CSV table of C-alpha atoms and ligand atoms in Angstrom, one decimal:
chain,number,residue,atom,x,y,z
Z,11,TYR,CA,16.4,-36.2,-52.7
Z,16,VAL,CA,27.2,-37.8,-45.6
Z,17,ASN,CA,29.9,-35.1,-45.2
Z,18,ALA,CA,33.0,-34.6,-43.1
Z,19,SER,CA,30.7,-33.8,-40.1
Z,20,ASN,CA,28.8,-37.0,-40.5
Z,21,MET,CA,25.7,-35.1,-41.5
Z,22,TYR,CA,23.5,-35.0,-44.6
Z,23,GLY,CA,24.9,-32.5,-47.1
Z,24,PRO,CA,22.6,-29.9,-48.6
Z,25,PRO,CA,22.7,-29.6,-52.4
Z,26,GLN,CA,26.1,-28.8,-53.9
Z,27,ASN,CA,24.7,-25.5,-55.2
Z,28,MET,CA,22.0,-24.1,-52.9
Z,29,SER,CA,20.2,-20.9,-53.7
Z,30,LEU,CA,18.8,-18.3,-51.4
Z,31,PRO,CA,15.0,-18.1,-51.5
Z,32,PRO,CA,14.0,-16.0,-54.6
Z,33,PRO,CA,13.2,-12.4,-54.0
Z,34,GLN,CA,10.6,-12.3,-56.8
Z,35,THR,CA,6.9,-12.9,-56.0
Z,36,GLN,CA,6.0,-16.5,-56.6
Z,37,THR,CA,2.7,-17.9,-58.0
Z,38,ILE,CA,0.8,-21.2,-57.6
Z,39,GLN,CA,-0.2,-23.0,-60.8
Z,40,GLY,CA,-3.9,-23.0,-61.6
Z,41,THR,CA,-4.8,-20.1,-59.3
Z,42,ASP,CA,-4.4,-16.4,-58.6
Z,43,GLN,CA,-2.6,-16.8,-55.3
Z,44,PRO,CA,0.9,-15.1,-55.0
Z,45,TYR,CA,3.4,-15.6,-52.2
Z,46,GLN,CA,6.8,-14.2,-51.4
Z,47,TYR,CA,9.7,-15.8,-49.5
Z,48,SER,CA,11.1,-13.3,-46.9
Z,49,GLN,CA,14.7,-12.3,-47.4
Z,50,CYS,CA,14.9,-11.9,-43.6
Z,51,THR,CA,16.7,-8.6,-43.9
Z,52,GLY,CA,14.2,-6.7,-41.8
Z,53,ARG,CA,13.2,-6.7,-38.2
Z,54,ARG,CA,13.7,-9.8,-36.1
Z,55,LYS,CA,11.2,-10.4,-33.2
Z,56,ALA,CA,10.6,-13.6,-31.2
Z,57,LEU,CA,7.9,-14.9,-28.9
Z,58,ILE,CA,9.2,-17.8,-26.8
Z,59,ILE,CA,6.9,-19.7,-24.5
Z,60,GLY,CA,7.9,-22.4,-22.0
Z,61,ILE,CA,5.5,-23.9,-19.5
Z,62,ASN,CA,6.2,-26.5,-16.8
Z,63,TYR,CA,2.8,-26.1,-15.0
Z,64,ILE,CA,4.7,-26.1,-11.8
Z,65,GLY,CA,2.8,-27.5,-8.8
Z,66,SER,CA,0.0,-29.1,-11.0
Z,67,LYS,CA,-0.9,-32.7,-11.4
Z,68,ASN,CA,0.6,-32.8,-14.8
Z,69,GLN,CA,3.8,-30.7,-14.2
Z,70,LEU,CA,6.3,-31.1,-17.0
Z,71,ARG,CA,10.0,-31.2,-16.9
Z,72,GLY,CA,12.2,-29.4,-19.4
Z,73,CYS,CA,9.9,-26.9,-21.1
Z,74,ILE,CA,11.1,-23.8,-19.4
Z,75,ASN,CA,14.6,-25.0,-20.2
Z,76,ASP,CA,13.6,-25.4,-23.8
Z,77,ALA,CA,12.5,-21.8,-23.9
Z,78,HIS,CA,15.8,-20.6,-22.4
Z,79,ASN,CA,17.7,-22.7,-25.0
Z,80,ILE,CA,15.9,-21.0,-27.9
Z,81,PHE,CA,16.4,-17.6,-26.3
Z,82,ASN,CA,20.1,-18.2,-26.1
Z,83,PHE,CA,20.3,-19.7,-29.6
Z,84,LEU,CA,18.5,-16.8,-31.2
Z,85,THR,CA,20.3,-14.0,-29.3
Z,86,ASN,CA,23.8,-15.4,-29.7
Z,87,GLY,CA,23.8,-16.2,-33.4
Z,88,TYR,CA,20.7,-14.9,-35.2
Z,89,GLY,CA,20.3,-11.2,-34.5
Z,90,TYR,CA,17.3,-11.3,-32.2
Z,91,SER,CA,17.8,-8.5,-29.6
Z,92,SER,CA,16.6,-9.0,-26.1
Z,93,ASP,CA,14.4,-5.9,-26.5
Z,94,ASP,CA,12.7,-7.7,-29.4
Z,95,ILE,CA,12.0,-10.9,-27.6
Z,96,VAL,CA,9.1,-11.7,-25.3
Z,97,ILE,CA,9.8,-14.8,-23.3
Z,98,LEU,CA,6.9,-16.2,-21.2
Z,99,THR,CA,7.8,-18.8,-18.6
Z,100,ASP,CA,6.0,-20.0,-15.4
Z,101,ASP,CA,8.9,-20.1,-12.9
Z,102,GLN,CA,10.0,-16.5,-12.9
Z,103,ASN,CA,8.9,-13.5,-10.9
Z,104,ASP,CA,7.3,-11.0,-13.3
Z,105,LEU,CA,3.6,-11.5,-13.7
Z,106,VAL,CA,3.5,-9.9,-17.2
Z,107,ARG,CA,5.9,-12.6,-18.4
Z,108,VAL,CA,3.9,-15.6,-17.0
Z,109,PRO,CA,2.3,-17.7,-19.8
Z,110,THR,CA,-1.3,-17.1,-18.8
Z,111,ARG,CA,-3.8,-17.3,-21.6
Z,112,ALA,CA,-4.2,-13.5,-21.7
Z,113,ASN,CA,-0.5,-12.9,-21.7
Z,114,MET,CA,0.0,-15.4,-24.5
Z,115,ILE,CA,-2.8,-13.9,-26.6
Z,116,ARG,CA,-1.4,-10.4,-26.1
Z,117,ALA,CA,2.2,-11.6,-26.9
Z,118,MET,CA,0.9,-13.3,-30.1
Z,119,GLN,CA,-0.6,-10.0,-31.2
Z,120,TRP,CA,2.6,-8.2,-30.3
Z,121,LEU,CA,4.7,-10.6,-32.4
Z,122,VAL,CA,3.0,-9.9,-35.7
Z,123,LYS,CA,1.9,-6.3,-35.2
Z,124,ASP,CA,3.0,-4.0,-38.0
Z,125,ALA,CA,5.1,-6.7,-39.6
Z,126,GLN,CA,6.7,-5.6,-42.9
Z,127,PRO,CA,7.9,-7.7,-45.9
Z,128,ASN,CA,11.3,-9.2,-45.3
Z,129,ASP,CA,10.9,-9.2,-41.5
Z,130,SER,CA,11.7,-12.4,-39.7
Z,131,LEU,CA,9.4,-13.4,-36.8
Z,132,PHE,CA,10.1,-16.5,-34.6
Z,133,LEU,CA,7.7,-18.4,-32.4
Z,134,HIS,CA,8.6,-21.2,-30.0
Z,135,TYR,CA,6.3,-23.1,-27.7
Z,136,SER,CA,7.1,-25.9,-25.3
Z,137,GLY,CA,4.3,-27.2,-23.0
Z,138,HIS,CA,1.2,-29.4,-23.1
Z,139,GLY,CA,-0.2,-30.1,-26.5
Z,140,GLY,CA,-3.3,-32.0,-27.5
Z,141,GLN,CA,-5.9,-32.8,-30.1
Z,142,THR,CA,-9.6,-32.0,-29.7
Z,154,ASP,CA,-8.2,-29.3,-33.7
Z,155,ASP,CA,-4.7,-29.1,-32.3
Z,156,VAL,CA,-4.5,-26.9,-29.2
Z,157,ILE,CA,-2.0,-25.5,-26.7
Z,158,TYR,CA,-2.4,-25.0,-23.0
Z,159,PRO,CA,-1.6,-21.8,-21.1
Z,160,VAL,CA,-0.6,-22.2,-17.5
Z,161,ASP,CA,-4.1,-21.2,-16.4
Z,162,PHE,CA,-5.9,-23.5,-18.8
Z,163,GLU,CA,-7.9,-25.2,-16.1
Z,164,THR,CA,-9.9,-22.0,-15.7
Z,165,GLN,CA,-9.4,-20.2,-19.0
Z,166,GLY,CA,-9.1,-23.1,-21.4
Z,167,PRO,CA,-6.7,-23.7,-24.3
Z,168,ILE,CA,-5.8,-21.7,-27.3
Z,169,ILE,CA,-7.0,-23.5,-30.4
Z,170,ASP,CA,-5.3,-23.8,-33.8
Z,171,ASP,CA,-7.9,-21.6,-35.6
Z,172,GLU,CA,-7.3,-18.7,-33.2
Z,173,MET,CA,-3.5,-18.9,-33.5
Z,174,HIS,CA,-4.0,-18.9,-37.3
Z,175,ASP,CA,-6.3,-15.8,-37.1
Z,176,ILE,CA,-3.9,-13.9,-34.8
Z,177,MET,CA,-0.5,-14.8,-36.3
Z,178,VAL,CA,-1.0,-16.0,-39.9
Z,179,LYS,CA,-4.0,-14.2,-41.4
Z,180,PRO,CA,-2.8,-10.6,-40.9
Z,181,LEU,CA,0.7,-11.1,-42.3
Z,182,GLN,CA,1.7,-9.1,-45.4
Z,183,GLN,CA,3.2,-10.7,-48.4
Z,184,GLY,CA,6.8,-11.6,-47.7
Z,185,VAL,CA,6.8,-11.6,-43.9
Z,186,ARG,CA,8.5,-14.6,-42.5
Z,187,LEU,CA,7.1,-16.4,-39.4
Z,188,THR,CA,9.2,-19.4,-38.3
Z,189,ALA,CA,7.5,-21.5,-35.7
Z,190,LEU,CA,9.0,-24.3,-33.7
Z,191,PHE,CA,6.8,-26.5,-31.4
Z,192,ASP,CA,8.3,-28.9,-28.9
Z,193,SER,CA,4.8,-29.9,-27.8
Z,194,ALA,CA,3.1,-33.2,-28.7
Z,195,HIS,CA,0.3,-33.4,-31.2
Z,196,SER,CA,1.0,-30.0,-32.6
Z,197,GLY,CA,1.4,-30.8,-36.3
Z,198,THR,CA,-1.6,-28.8,-37.5
Z,199,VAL,CA,-1.5,-26.1,-34.8
Z,200,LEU,CA,-1.2,-23.3,-37.3
Z,201,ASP,CA,-3.7,-24.8,-39.8
Z,202,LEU,CA,-1.0,-24.6,-42.5
Z,203,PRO,CA,-2.0,-26.4,-45.8
Z,204,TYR,CA,1.4,-27.8,-46.8
Z,205,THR,CA,3.3,-30.5,-44.9
Z,206,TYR,CA,6.8,-31.9,-45.8
Z,207,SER,CA,8.6,-34.9,-44.3
Z,208,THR,CA,12.1,-36.2,-45.1
Z,209,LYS,CA,10.4,-38.3,-47.7
Z,210,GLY,CA,8.7,-35.5,-49.5
Z,211,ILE,CA,5.3,-33.8,-49.6
Z,212,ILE,CA,2.8,-35.5,-47.4
Z,213,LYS,CA,0.0,-33.0,-47.5
Z,214,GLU,CA,-0.9,-30.2,-49.9
Z,215,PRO,CA,-4.1,-28.5,-51.1
Z,216,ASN,CA,-6.3,-29.8,-54.0
Z,217,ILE,CA,-6.0,-26.8,-56.2
Z,269,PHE,CA,-4.0,-18.7,-49.4
Z,270,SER,CA,-1.6,-16.5,-47.4
Z,271,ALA,CA,0.9,-14.5,-49.4
Z,272,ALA,CA,3.2,-14.5,-46.4
Z,273,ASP,CA,6.1,-16.8,-45.7
Z,274,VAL,CA,5.1,-19.1,-42.8
Z,275,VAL,CA,7.0,-22.2,-41.9
Z,276,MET,CA,6.8,-24.4,-38.9
Z,277,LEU,CA,8.6,-27.4,-37.4
Z,278,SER,CA,7.0,-30.0,-35.1
Z,279,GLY,CA,7.5,-33.6,-34.1
Z,280,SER,CA,5.3,-36.6,-34.6
Z,281,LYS,CA,5.6,-40.1,-33.1
Z,295,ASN,CA,12.7,-34.8,-20.4
Z,296,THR,CA,13.4,-32.1,-23.0
Z,297,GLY,CA,12.1,-30.6,-26.3
Z,298,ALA,CA,12.9,-32.9,-29.2
Z,299,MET,CA,12.5,-30.4,-31.9
Z,300,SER,CA,14.5,-27.6,-30.3
Z,301,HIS,CA,17.1,-30.1,-29.3
Z,302,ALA,CA,17.6,-31.2,-32.9
Z,303,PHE,CA,17.2,-27.8,-34.5
Z,304,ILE,CA,19.7,-26.1,-32.2
Z,305,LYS,CA,22.3,-28.8,-32.5
Z,306,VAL,CA,22.1,-29.1,-36.3
Z,307,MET,CA,22.2,-25.3,-36.8
Z,308,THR,CA,25.0,-24.9,-34.2
Z,309,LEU,CA,27.2,-27.5,-35.8
Z,310,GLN,CA,26.4,-27.0,-39.5
Z,311,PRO,CA,24.6,-23.7,-40.0
Z,312,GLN,CA,24.4,-24.3,-43.8
Z,313,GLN,CA,21.2,-26.3,-44.5
Z,314,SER,CA,18.5,-26.5,-47.1
Z,315,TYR,CA,14.9,-27.0,-45.8
Z,316,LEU,CA,15.3,-30.7,-46.7
Z,317,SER,CA,18.8,-31.2,-45.3
Z,318,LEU,CA,17.6,-29.5,-42.1
Z,319,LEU,CA,14.8,-32.0,-41.8
Z,320,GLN,CA,17.1,-34.9,-42.7
Z,321,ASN,CA,19.7,-33.9,-40.2
Z,322,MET,CA,17.2,-33.2,-37.5
Z,323,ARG,CA,15.8,-36.7,-38.1
Z,324,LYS,CA,19.2,-38.3,-37.9
Z,325,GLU,CA,20.0,-36.5,-34.6
Z,326,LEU,CA,16.7,-37.7,-33.1
Z,327,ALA,CA,16.8,-41.4,-34.3
Z,328,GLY,CA,17.1,-43.8,-31.4
Z,329,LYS,CA,17.1,-41.3,-28.6
Z,330,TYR,CA,13.7,-39.7,-29.4
Z,331,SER,CA,10.5,-41.3,-30.7
Z,332,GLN,CA,9.9,-38.1,-32.8
Z,333,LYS,CA,10.2,-37.4,-36.5
Z,334,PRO,CA,10.3,-33.8,-37.6
Z,335,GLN,CA,7.9,-32.4,-40.2
Z,336,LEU,CA,7.8,-29.0,-41.8
Z,337,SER,CA,4.5,-27.2,-42.5
Z,338,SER,CA,4.1,-24.1,-44.7
Z,339,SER,CA,1.6,-21.6,-45.9
Z,340,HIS,CA,3.0,-22.0,-49.4
Z,341,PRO,CA,4.8,-24.6,-51.5
Z,342,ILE,CA,8.4,-24.9,-50.6
Z,343,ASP,CA,11.4,-25.5,-52.9
Z,344,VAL,CA,13.0,-27.7,-50.3
Z,345,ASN,CA,16.4,-27.4,-51.9
Z,346,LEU,CA,16.5,-23.7,-51.1
Z,347,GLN,CA,18.8,-22.6,-48.3
Z,348,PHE,CA,17.0,-22.3,-44.9
Z,349,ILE,CA,17.5,-18.8,-43.5
Z,350,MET,CA,16.1,-16.8,-40.6
K,1,DFH,C1,5.5,-17.3,-12.4
K,1,DFH,C2,4.5,-17.3,-11.2
K,1,DFH,O1,5.0,-18.2,-10.2
K,1,DFH,C3,3.1,-17.8,-11.7
K,1,DFH,C4,2.0,-17.0,-11.7
K,1,DFH,C5,0.7,-17.4,-12.1
K,1,DFH,C6,0.5,-18.7,-12.6
K,1,DFH,C7,1.6,-19.5,-12.6
K,1,DFH,C8,2.9,-19.1,-12.2
K,1,DFH,C9,4.4,-15.8,-10.6
K,1,DFH,C10,4.9,-14.7,-11.2
K,1,DFH,C11,4.8,-13.4,-10.7
K,1,DFH,C12,4.1,-13.2,-9.4
K,1,DFH,C13,3.6,-14.4,-8.8
K,1,DFH,C14,3.7,-15.6,-9.4
């Protein structure tokens, strides 16, 4: 619980997530892993807050990195990606609060079992609740974890995958997910729920550390389990970044299963 590429090996025999509906002991709450054979849609948001007193470097670039990663290896078509960044010239693609909320609704609308939805955010993060900050937050305010959960998690049918990756700080509970995993094992779980398949990656204590690690690991060694992905992301980050990656989920994860999108 090292190979020729100097990375942590997944289990010798790694299974795809099971297609059968899963259950949680002691309760009547089913869930289903997505097979990720359906529609692939992504919402990618990168905000530098250009011109502001707390302008950031690298977040727009993080978004472009994820866009390129998803379109050039993972079957996300440009027509099925909404990318919101604050340095480009189309108002409908600026990460204003209203555009972000609309895009979040668009992402999950009519999602079907075995679809694979992806969410990426790089920008300001904070803890009031964890929150994220649209470019117009000074006037419109942030978007809080409870609302992101209500928009993007609550409506999902059994077996819809949502994979979320946050490059922002203090974003560990940003989707209000009840399970959290580190490289060392389970660090949070309910004291016994969605039936969907929601998983998220975020960092806990320039450029996005999580997208940096995720893209490099998946580019060099695309075969990973949930746990080996975490371990290899952690290895890549050690020394350079102050961040350690954690995986949160709407359901218990068999961490030895293959990570697919
Ligand atoms: C991205 C853009 O600079 C912007 C607009 C609004 C807030 C922050 C940044 C823009 C886009 C279209 C038209 C005007 C300005």
